């Protein structure tokens, strides 16, 4: 399962 | 033995028209199980292992939704990074992200990771404590500031220690037939004569899973690394792996040299010799 929250723009 | 789940993401900008080429792949140990390729027709997360096909439409919908959100973030990143590094619109650039968790033999959380690279170089990475960041330069430091203020580490930690692990376990159970099976290396040795005084011995391991393996030579029972060549472990193409290690020896002294093989699927280390 992929991450839902925590992939944020640099 | 120990297990892991990893996701890898690559985004490559396409100067002149449209969005980046985006490719996501997911692994449990050394077995790929999902993929998304922006150039493919389906625009869905797709299965690549039989045991993942057990998941219903609700899974595929959610993973497609998250993975497309991943890609859009990378898309925006490519423009931000261009600005950070004062680069033109003329060249293609690359963003890579990898994350996932490791668990031990008890399937309990061992370690987690989340790292990001721009044009093949370290940019920012979550440290081992899953609480702070390693930022390689002043651009990545600006990003660290953004991510701290949005509590990114906190969110990723939650995932790495929770979901990532819980779902790794689910996959290992669902795919036990192959995921929990070890395939011992199939070994043999070949001999070649280069001249009248020099021969090569090559010690092969084939058909093994998982990929991690150790192959070494000994001369009269002592470790021998000089005059040896060891190839990178390589995929067979059927889910298993291959590797060889070769040694150059004086013709006629072949019997002094023994090859030693260690692998999770071998209860005892294995010894081979030329005869």
């Amino acid at each position: 399962k992929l991450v839902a929250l925590g992939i944020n723009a640099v | 033995g120990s297990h892991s789940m990893r996701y890898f993401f690559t985004s490559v900008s396409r100067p002149g028209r449209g969005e980046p080429r985006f490719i996501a792949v997911g692994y449990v140990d050394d077995t790929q199980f999902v993929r998304f390729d922006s150039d493919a027709a389906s625009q869905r997360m797709e299965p690549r292992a039989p045991w993942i096909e057990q998941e219903g439409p609700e899974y595929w919908d959610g993973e497609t939704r998250k993975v497309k959100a991943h890609s859009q973030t990378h898309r925006v990143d490519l423009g931000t990074l261009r600005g950070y590094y004062n680069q033109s619109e003329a060249g293609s650039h690359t963003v890579q992200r990898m994350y996932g968790c490791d668990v031990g033999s008890d399937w309990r959380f061992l370690r987690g990771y989340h790292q990001y690279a721009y044009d093949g170089k370290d940019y920012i990475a979550l440290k081992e404590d899953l609480r702070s960041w390693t930022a390689a330069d002043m651009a990545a430091q600006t990003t660290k500031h953004k991510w701290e203020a949005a509590h990114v580490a906190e969110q990723l930690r939650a995932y790495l220690e929770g979901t990532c692990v819980e779902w790794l376990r689910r996959y290992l159970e669902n795919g036990k037939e192959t995921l929990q099976r070890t395939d011992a290396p199939k070994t043999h040795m070949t001999h070649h004569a280069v001249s009248d005084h020099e021969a090569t011995l090559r010690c092969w391991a084939l058909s093994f899973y998982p990929a991690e393996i150790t192959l070494t030579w000994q001369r009269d029972g002592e470790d021998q690394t000089q005059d040896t060549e060891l190839v990178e472990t390589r995929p067979a193409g059927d889910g298993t792996f291959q590797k060889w290690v070769a040694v150059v020896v004086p013709s006629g002294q072949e019997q002094r040299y023994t090859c030693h093989v260690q692998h999770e699927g071998l209860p005892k280390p294995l010894t081979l010799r030329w005869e």
Partner: protein, 100 residues
């Protein structure tokens, strides 16, 4: 812009025996950037039905890919893979050798 040349290995899935069905692999790794061209060759000639794995990469960020096609080894036929990449001034050819 970091640039890393591809390492190349060409090899069969199964141990080779003349006349027997098999698969021909060309494994490229350690390269950057990701754009790369890989052909498998039968007697100097490009083979058409070649597939490849989904792009992935190693801890050091270097990319790797597997290209593969079905093939039947024989005494006479020569098999190679041909690689071009930005770091290479001319395509690189590695011959398949059933003992490597």
């Amino acid at each position: 812009m970091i640039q890393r040349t591809p390492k190349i290995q060409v090899y069969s899935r199964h141990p080779a025996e003349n006349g027997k069905s098999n698969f021909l692999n060309c494994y490229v790794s350690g390269f950057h950037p990701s754009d790369i061209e890989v052909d498998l060759l039968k007697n100097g000639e490009r083979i058409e039905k070649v597939e490849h794995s989904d792009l992935s990469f190693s801890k050091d960020w270097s990319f790797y890919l597997l290209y593969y096609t079905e093939f039947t080894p024989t005494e006479k036929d020569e098999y190679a893979c041909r690689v071009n990449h930005v770091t290479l001034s001319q395509p690189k050819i590695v011959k398949w050798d059933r003992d490597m």
